[PDB]
Symmetry: none
Subunit: 144 residues, 12 copies
Amino acid sequence: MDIDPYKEFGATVELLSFLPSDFFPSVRDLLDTASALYREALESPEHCSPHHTALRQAILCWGELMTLATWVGVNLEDPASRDLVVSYVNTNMGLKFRQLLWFHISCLTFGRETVIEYLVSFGVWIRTPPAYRPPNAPILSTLP
Amino acid sequence: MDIDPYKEFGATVELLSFLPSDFFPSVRDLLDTASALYREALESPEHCSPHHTALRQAILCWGELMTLATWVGVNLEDPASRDLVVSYVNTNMGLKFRQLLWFHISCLTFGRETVIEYLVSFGVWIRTPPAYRPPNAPILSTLP
Amino acid sequence: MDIDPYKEFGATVELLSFLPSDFFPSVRDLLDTASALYREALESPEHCSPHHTALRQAILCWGELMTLATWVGVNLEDPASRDLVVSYVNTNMGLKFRQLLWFHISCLTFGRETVIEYLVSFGVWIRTPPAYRPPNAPILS
Amino acid sequence: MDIDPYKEFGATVELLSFLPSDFFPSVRDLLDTASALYREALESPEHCSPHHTALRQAILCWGELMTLATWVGVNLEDPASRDLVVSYVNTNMGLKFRQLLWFHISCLTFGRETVIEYLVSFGVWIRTPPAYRPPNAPILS
Amino acid sequence: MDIDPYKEFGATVELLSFLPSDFFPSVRDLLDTASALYREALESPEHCSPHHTALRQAILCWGELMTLATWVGVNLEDPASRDLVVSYVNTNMGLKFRQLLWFHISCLTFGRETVIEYLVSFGVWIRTPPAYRPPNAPILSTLP
Amino acid sequence: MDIDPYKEFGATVELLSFLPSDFFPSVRDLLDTASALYREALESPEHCSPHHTALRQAILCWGELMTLATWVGVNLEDPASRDLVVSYVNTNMGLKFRQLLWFHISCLTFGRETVIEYLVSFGVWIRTPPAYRPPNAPILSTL
Amino acid sequence: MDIDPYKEFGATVELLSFLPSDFFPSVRDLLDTASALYREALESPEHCSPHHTALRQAILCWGELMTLATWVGVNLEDPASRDLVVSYVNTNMGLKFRQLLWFHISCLTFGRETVIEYLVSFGVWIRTPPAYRPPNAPILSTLP
Amino acid sequence: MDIDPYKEFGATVELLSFLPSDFFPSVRDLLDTASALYREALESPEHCSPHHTALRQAILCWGELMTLATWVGVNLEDPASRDLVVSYVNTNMGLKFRQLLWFHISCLTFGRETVIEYLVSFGVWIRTPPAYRPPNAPILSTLP
Amino acid sequence: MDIDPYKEFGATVELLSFLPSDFFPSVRDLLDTASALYREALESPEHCSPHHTALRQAILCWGELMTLATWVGVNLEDPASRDLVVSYVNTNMGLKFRQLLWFHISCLTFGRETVIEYLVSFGVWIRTPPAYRPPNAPILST
Amino acid sequence: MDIDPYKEFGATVELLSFLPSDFFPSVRDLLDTASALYREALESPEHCSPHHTALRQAILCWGELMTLATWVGVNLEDPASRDLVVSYVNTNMGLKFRQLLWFHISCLTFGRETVIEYLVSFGVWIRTPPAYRPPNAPILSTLP
Amino acid sequence: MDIDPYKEFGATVELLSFLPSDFFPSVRDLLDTASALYREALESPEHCSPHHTALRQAILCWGELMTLATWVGVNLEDPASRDLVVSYVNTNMGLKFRQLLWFHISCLTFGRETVIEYLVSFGVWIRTPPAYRPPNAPILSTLP
Amino acid sequence: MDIDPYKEFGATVELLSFLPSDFFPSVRDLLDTASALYREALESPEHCSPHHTALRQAILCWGELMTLATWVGVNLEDPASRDLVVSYVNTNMGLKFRQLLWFHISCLTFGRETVIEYLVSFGVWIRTPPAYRPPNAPILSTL
């Protein structure tokens, strides 16, 4: 059906592809950040924000996938098949959920426009050759 | 985190398990009707509704899970494990994905309060013994 | 009972879990800082602040725990168990008390809002891989 | 620093010295009553009272001490050493936490002034010689 | 005819050569960034800016040259001649196409004056001896 | 991507494909007329028009394609490969540069609407069967 | 009698024990700078400031202790006794007199609030781990 | 430099040298007087007076000298050396601190101008030959 | 006849002599900077500024001195003599041109007052011994 | 980068090519007249004229050129190389300095327009065939 | 009659003794900077400032001492005596005039108050132990 | 640098050389007069006059030169070299220091314009033949 996860917010898969795949934090760190910062808002009966709705959906889907991983690990018999299944569900969709979690957590923390211009700036920085790339890569922060 | 997918939309998991498990349409039928009725709205680059956001996320995650099913079928060596994984996905995740898809598609076609009151009405009707209920099951329609 | 010490003040253990172990000063350094900066407010007969109250309780608990270590070193026989107990006390609870004392002292010194926003920014910095984080960690001052 | 755990609340280590050591209830009993009476208040993002702050800190530190006791009983290899550790952590350092838990639970339940007057009256009762000491010990009620 | 592609835009071929040849990003990276950031504007049926017009022409003719390179590789029989032609294209037209694409993408992103002043600043900085210049090279960033 | 060269000017590839393949003037004739009519405007530092910008890019890149052709001719040692490369760069890209040069020169000379109407009318004329085709093919002029 | 020299000046013995013992420059350098900067004020028959009074008393009694050192080095016959006496005078009393002279000279030349804030800042800085503090130690200087 | 400890308050060494060396009270008597009369003022965090500041400094460094004496007595194994050190302290600096203690406590009680007038009068009395001087020397008192 | 090239512009050879030899960029770098920044003003038939006039004269003199260097590299039979002449021209007399070009370009870029103030401050810094001299030299970039 | 030494002064290189290279006075004579007429103006710290600026630069460049010639004659060992370098410096490198010195001295003495008109008139005179050429060549004069 | 060179301008000999003996620049460097910055003012017939008067006197004195050194070296026929005299001059008088030249040049350049507080700042910096001494020593500059 | 000690004070080395070299009082006499008349002014922590500044600098310099003479008389050996050094520093520098000290002391007293007039008057009096000049030499007197 070709739905873009970030089209409604303002980004695209291509804009999120400026950051290298290994730039994103791990799933556990992202989930801990989301909990610690917005547990009371992600466990509330109100539409706090489209970012909150997207985080709720993504967190439920990741819980779905983790229950799948536990179920296959504790029920399936073939050890090699179990290993490949768990590795796939932890890496291939792990990256796709790391991207969503990072995008929405960073948007809620700093600002959607701030995250968009940060994506553009980091694209510029990572595109600059290493010889002329300054050592200070752009970061999202509220401090001088 | 105990996040309820329907808490912000006014329902709960027990309100959608009130209806019989086999009442909900097939995931394929739900995707077909969602496409046919709201392709332009779901692909549009603005927030239209929290239902639209949740529907976009649900469709994307179901596509991710179909990618999972294709990958495990192609890669896993043992057809027994392949069948177990695909059956587990399509049944256990299928039920709750088609619950979510039905809820959001109906809340887009009809009112959210209409869908909630229909859930209550259908649950009560199916609990009531046949001799003391209207013969025909409740159906929510757009008045042809 | 699931009690979160920083949830009263606006943080969580998850929020402060991003701070690395080497981030915090020694317990002795934190206690000297607390003394030299707020002895007259920690030894006064009134509630200056919830931070002051929590700091007082933390200091008393640490004093009890060092009484624990001294009693162990005096009254256990086998040096293997003695050193295991003392090392566990000075490391595992040492980190927890360092984190608690640092949080309350930093709140008193800078501002609760300042501390809890610097801590969010520092968490963002930690979560970024070293290949892309700036070399200099954020400074709270 | 000579920090008094009860100076901010108006008592003093010497007022609570009136009460005998064995007068205070069990740590388990105090924790159960604290839970059943103030779980919602102690699990809330609000400085409900300095008593709430001190109670939260004490409960968390007691959880730490029980973690220490479990860690000793599991990891420690010497049976005599582990027995001594688990016996005295629940005997000597259980007493301070019993006193502090009793003080704060009783304050939250009855009143700071009521607890202070009860301390004075129990001091009088325990000072009274047995020939003239009423059988009914003072009770907060 | 003596046409300079930047006299219209306030720059010069000498000004674009003032930066090192290897400072400019790859053709692939520049095309990906141009796509991600301005696909809708570049495909729009209207004049958005002279930068947009020049960029449209630049991508079109780079595509023409890539079709030429593929045709050469799949039609010529001499591997040495094929290698020479492809290398000459990618290493001689590639540099100037990188310069043009970078100039127009950066102008659209930041500002023509910003890009021109950045050219001046970076050239001066790179010609200044290291002991008497700021340690980090100038960069273009959208973040405040 | 899928950027159309004429979409911003109102035409399309297929709308301009009404004209036959051999209808367009040669690259040399187009360059000579572009020079003789707009050398000053094309060498000016001003945004004279989007037509001027596109024509500048087209001319400047045809020049570098010709430099590529000369470099191949003077460097490649295989005569057959050299001949194939020159013929391809002169014909395949030559045609689609003749199209662009003609479109922009004609637009500058006569009017964008005039060129669009001429394209439509010439499509009608060339679609008409030869028996019923009038001998005067449409031509764009001012006389 | 349990008097603290710094209660009237806004500090205690601990705030000067907060700073490292090796930080205080020298009992001779402090005397030289006190001379060079305030000889006229210290010799004047006028109450200039409590810092002036305390500094006068400290200088006179350090001169008294130096007279003690000379007397014990000359009249006393035991080399070991002389060595221990002079070492004790120059170290154990030396640290206290060095702290007092530093505090009063620094207060006179900068400000009591400036010196107190500097004590706090330097103590916190030196206790903070190096990786998370500004690289250079705090300094006390009158230069814009 | 050569600071005069009494020039700040009005006296000098020669003006205070009118009093015989054995006129001054014992150090213990002066310390008990100062305590019993001004303990609260000497403990306060306020600059009560320059006399209070001078007494604070003198008392603390006399305590330091007593710590020196005890350290000598308990460390120097040489009995003659220890005896000489303590005797020199208590004799030579005993007078120098007796003069300061007497001057400042007598300026706090009965007033500084009265102390100056008393010093002049006692100088007259002590310079008068023994035959012609009245049997009662001048005294500091507030009683007729 | 005792002419100071910088006295007219407010400086002195003594003031400019404090900058180390390695402070200045290469001659080619300075010429490229001058071209890329002020070609339109150094090729116009106008008296844009005394800095522009002096820069034009300096550029012409350097180009003509490089013509001399090429001539002595082409029309000399002694390799040692050729090497000595070329090295002397490219280093000893080229340092003066580096200093002159840098001074005039820096004035045109930053302001004459800014440049001379930076010169004074850098002179103080370079006269300070290394032990008490802060590691970072002053930078002229406003 | 083509810069004309005379373009800013109304003239151009080919305009001074009307004058034969044998016409310009010797460098020594030009320097002597420049000194005797404008030592005060050339030594002054003031932008008297662009002609003054160019004269100062040319004189200093000629000074360092004679320094080069002396250095060659002294250090260099090969007599033939010394002779060739010295002769080149004095003649081929000196003719152009003769032109520059003559132009600027004559423009500072007679005026820029007068010098340009003199250039045109001397071009006419030197173009005239020898039969019709007057023996009195055009000369720059200031009413003797 | 014991005249302080700097007491007129507000400093003292010991106030300039904060600076180490090797901190001061070379005599040649100081003379070069004095010439380059104030040759026009140190020769005018105007009382420009007491700093200018003192600089004039110091410069003529150093000229006289250099004439002394040259005369001694030329005459007196004694190598060891000549070496000793010249070394003593260039060391002792060299330092005594480096101090004065630096003080007056720096005062004229930066401000008498600026220099007088820089002396205090450098004293407090050099007095700090090396461990706690920041790497940036104070300097006189007008740039950020 | 060509700096004149007297240019700011209105005189010149030639004007001071216009008087005979043996006219100026001894350095010791000049220092004694300077002390006795202006010790407080010269030691004061303030600018009193450019004459005071120049006199302070001259006195410090003469002290430095006397320390140099002591050093060359003590630390050095005992050849005639020490005698030549002492004689040089006491005569050749002594003359110019006598001139400077005399000028500044005799300006601080008696006034600048009076000193400037006196230099000219005394020089012309000396150069005038004895038979046609007043018998007594000009002199400066406060009385």
